């Protein structure tokens, strides 16, 4: 089986993940404008790079999906309006929408739209690692609820470290264990780091 890490956000984490996965995608964060040159080099260098829009305005999302068609586009936002809109615009993935929210960041209506628009939901490990015991428990609760919805409607999904440091990276074995903890069966967790990433990449 070919395991894939869809979201690495640090150079040293990338080098380590490359030793453990068949393919690693590096996410380049942008908040106001997407820089073609900053991306261009990443492609030649890393090969596979995703544009990560962090708390973007709707206009930024629209522009990006139009201009950069050959790039994967991920959206991280805690604004339900932006999340819904990004899904409608057909971005490739919504990453951990429950972060900085008091709910899963996804519901029945949104899950249905995600499947229709072929948008994936990315489950990040990082938040759990950086949180204290109490915060971790709340995050897990929201992640579990998000998983049940994703499973119920067959929404594409993937597990990822979303690593910012070398020590945030995890071997497939341990990402699978994360999947089980949030409620996935072993095969589902395995598919979340192989089959689904393959479908998302095409």
UniProtKB/Swiss-Prot annotation:
Disulfide bonds: none annotated. Keywords: Cytoplasm, Endonuclease, Hydrolase, Nuclease, tRNA processing. It comes from Pyrococcus horikoshii (strain ATCC 700860 / DSM 12428 / JCM 9974 / NBRC 100139 / OT-3). This is Ribonuclease P protein component 3. The keyword Hydrolase applies. Pfam families: RNase_P_p30. It is an enzyme of class 3 (hydrolase). Part of ribonuclease P, a protein complex that generates mature tRNA molecules by cleaving their 5'-ends. Not absolutely essential for activity in vitro, however it strongly stimulates activity. Binds RNase P RNA. Optimum temperature is 70 degrees Celsius. Its main location: cytoplasm. InterPro entries: Pol/histidinol_Pase-like (IPR016195), RNase_P_comp-3_arc (IPR023539), RNase_P_p30 (IPR002738). It is found in: Cytoplasm.
